Design a protein around this ligand. Structure first.
Ligand SMILES: Nc1ncnc2c1ncn2[C@@H]1O[C@@H]2COP(=O)(O)O[C@H]2[C@H]1O
Ligand SMILES: Nc1ncnc2c1ncn2[C@@H]1O[C@@H]2COP(=O)(O)O[C@H]2[C@H]1O
Ligand SMILES: Nc1ncnc2c1ncn2[C@@H]1O[C@@H]2COP(=O)(O)O[C@H]2[C@H]1O
Ligand SMILES: Nc1ncnc2c1ncn2[C@@H]1O[C@@H]2COP(=O)(O)O[C@H]2[C@H]1O
Ligand SMILES: Nc1ncnc2c1ncn2[C@@H]1O[C@@H]2COP(=O)(O)O[C@H]2[C@H]1O
Ligand SMILES: Nc1ncnc2c1ncn2[C@@H]1O[C@@H]2COP(=O)(O)O[C@H]2[C@H]1O
Lengths: 155, 152, 155, 151, 151, 151
């Protein structure tokens, strides 16, 4: 928002490769240790229809069909994290979309190799986040809770 | 059900607040269990009364229910051979005082009322708890590429 | 005390081997993650006199002299931790005095090999803790602070 | 230059969030030698002196009040280029600009809750070390790893 | 007794699950000294000899076939009571009986996929070391940590 | 491109500081496939040839002597763009320039004690792999993770 910005939210999804390679906890832990507030979480198998909409911007790219099929092929961990500048900061935490360009210390820099098996998706902007959160979650899945760590993360 | 056995695990509000969700999940992942359901919820007192019905005559029942309803919980289902009993071993004794180092409660907790997690105590309790907390369409079946390296 | 027991304190010292082998942080982290409250901490070089008094109970053992000399030979990290049953629980976290008998998951079980190079000392009882705390720390080195994590560790 | 020293302080947020060990471990694993350490509650007067250069900034008063409000872990680390390298390990003062892999990049969000203070220069380090520690708190020890860290 | 040695092998499941580094790190952090190491594919002939004591057990044939089926990381570690202590670090042969904190307790489920083999005695270690390594693969090096690990 | 290979060696400082497991774990967690591994002490003759491109540099002689002075862990890792990516994981040759999150950024201080050597190109890797390993030490194995790492 514009109050303090602290209620900004982003959508993050661990892709099937992240689940298969047993990196869910590792990924969650990095967001937790950063100070962000987990406000929604579910393991789902996403429909192709949802994924087509999710990735509509990429519909003209040659990998689009396989991306959609692959993301529909197995479990995904869908999440919403909340905090100041969470959208941009989460993109920084995960690293460049192509792991080859993601420095060590980022999730993709540390844990994967190839752009099509890049572990995670994070919203690229506040507007994309609003759209992605709405697409993947119902409103009643976004939890309001009193974060005891807020005091130590925010001035 | 052998390798398809399932257990219910919930990270309690203290585990969420202390930022130990990832740590807990990681321990189950590294053990080789298969995550088949997961959600962040705020459970109603009604659900929790039913969850803990066996304990209704204990003096801590009311506060346990209120506490578990007071904040977010991470509900989970894990699948694998002897996962119910093995999960109990990984988490440690219900009372952290009796949970050795290396277990979740042994490493992270002090008091029985702030003991981070609940895990099903038996296959029958797991069936009941899974049904109570999850709909069938929240339980995912997936083909585990690691299964070959964990099982015969 | 007897109120709730939550203000019990224990004395822990990282020995020179723990400093040399770069395990100070690892050891502190294990007490932090357990939920105990750090109420004193200092790096010191302990005098032989203090150590003779500290280990008076062992004065008849053949290794007493070398123990005293060794503990005086390098930096020690002196600590006081506070919490319910902290004395006994800390002993469990550190493991048996002899690392050969300390199971994996304990500090000595994970990190050292021989009884004379066993990384750490923890008070063996509430009375020894009272004595050790008094010996190593002045009262004004024991800090009273409001522990925000207390709410999540104590019912 | 192996005997250079820097002053580092874990702020109350780092103590509260149980990150003292994590922070120390990062300095240990880098190869630096811990030569002083204490848990203290610093007076406002000490902190006013510590942060004197910032006295005209709008956040000065609250910075001082906050730093005095809870326990801090004061430390001195020793090694080649420790001042500048510690700054690199901690990351930008403002966590917004600190990349993942740094302490603030991994653990913090806001400049006012940024876990730690490290000396910004050798001159500031000398001043800060002297302010927080007495000479007899600074230990000399022979580092068995030194052979494997320094050519 | 500080020069005792044991043989450890990471089994194909440990390599496939990418736990080699994790396993090595546990022995390193304990203080033991790595004196030999190689990635190999063992022949069934070698493995039959390795596990000759088990030749009458019903799982012998499949154990041999499985251990020959893919790469193994063979190792020798040195230190006081390394044989017995390594067995404790790895945990009970059946992971069902291996407590959390042990390698098998933390990482495995089933006795047939139990990540690692460690010598059961000093004599078996001598025999296993000889079987898997040539003499010139066992390295003598001066351990800078030795002074901080041993009396 | 997925079958590209690089040569990595943990230098004596990495072995002495007990960071072998840590280093291996970083390559494993990235997704690369370990296809050769051994603990060795290299001769000066081998090392002279290994570092021949640096023969005119003032540190060449000391580098050769140092690398011959104790055990090294030689490795080959396989995967897409593994040469360039391994260089990124290890960080700048000089640790002063290597950011936190890299191996040298997290663990080292000085260029001469920089823990590890990684091939600087595909061609140098081919040459280094050939120099340090016999062909029969490079293992081909079926990687269960391949499906989750590659398209
Ligand atoms: N050039 C590419 N070839 C194949 N897949 C790609 C390419 N670029 C992007 N992708 C994938 O397309 C995905 C779309 O956005 P994600 O954040 O999910 O991460 C992206 C990659 O996983
Ligand atoms: N004596 C007790 N006092 C308070 N809470 C208790 C006591 N015994 C059990 N509990 C709590 O009751 C919970 C019921 O099952 P859980 O697995 O949630 O873990 C248990 C503890 O957190
Ligand atoms: N049998 C022994 N031989 C040598 N040192 C010992 C022996 N038993 C105990 N010690 C050491 O004496 C120390 C006294 O108590 P600590 O907890 O400091 O840890 C003990 C060991 O480090
Ligand atoms: N704009 C600001 N608002 C609040 N605090 C600030 C601001 N800029 C700097 N600081 C704080 O001032 C502190 C002084 O130096 P430190 O290294 O402690 O880290 C600095 C920050 O924590
Ligand atoms: N009942 C069993 N079924 C299958 N494998 C077994 C059984 N009991 C023991 N083993 C395996 O046999 C191996 C022999 O020694 P290891 O140390 O390699 O570890 C043992 C187990 O992996
Ligand atoms: N100026 C230097 N002084 C000393 N060693 C150097 C210098 N520059 C490069 N090196 C070392 O020489 C090595 C050559 O390649 P390495 O990858 O082994 O890593 C390099 C460094 O360890």
């Amino acid at each position: 928002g514009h109050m303090t910005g602290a209620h900004e939210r982003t959508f993050l999804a661990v892709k099937p490769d992240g689940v298969q390679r047993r990196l869910v906890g590792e990924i969650v832990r990095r967001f937790e240790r950063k100070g962000f507030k987990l406000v929604a979480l579910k393991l789902v198998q996403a429909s192709e229809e949802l994924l087509r909409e999710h990735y509509a911007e990429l519909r003209e790219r040659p990998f689009y069909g396989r991306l959609v099929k692959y993301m529909a092929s197995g479990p995904v961990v869908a999440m919403v994290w909340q905090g100041l500048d969470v959208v941009r900061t989460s993109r920084a935490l995960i690293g460049a979309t192509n792991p080859a360009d993601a420095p060590p210390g980022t999730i993709r820099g540390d844990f994967c190799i190839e752009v099509g098996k890049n572990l995670i998706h994070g919203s690229d902007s506040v507007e994309s986040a609003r759209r992605e959160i709405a697409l993947w979650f119902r409103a009643d899945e976004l939890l309001c809770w009193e974060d005891s760590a807020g005091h130590w993360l925010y001035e």
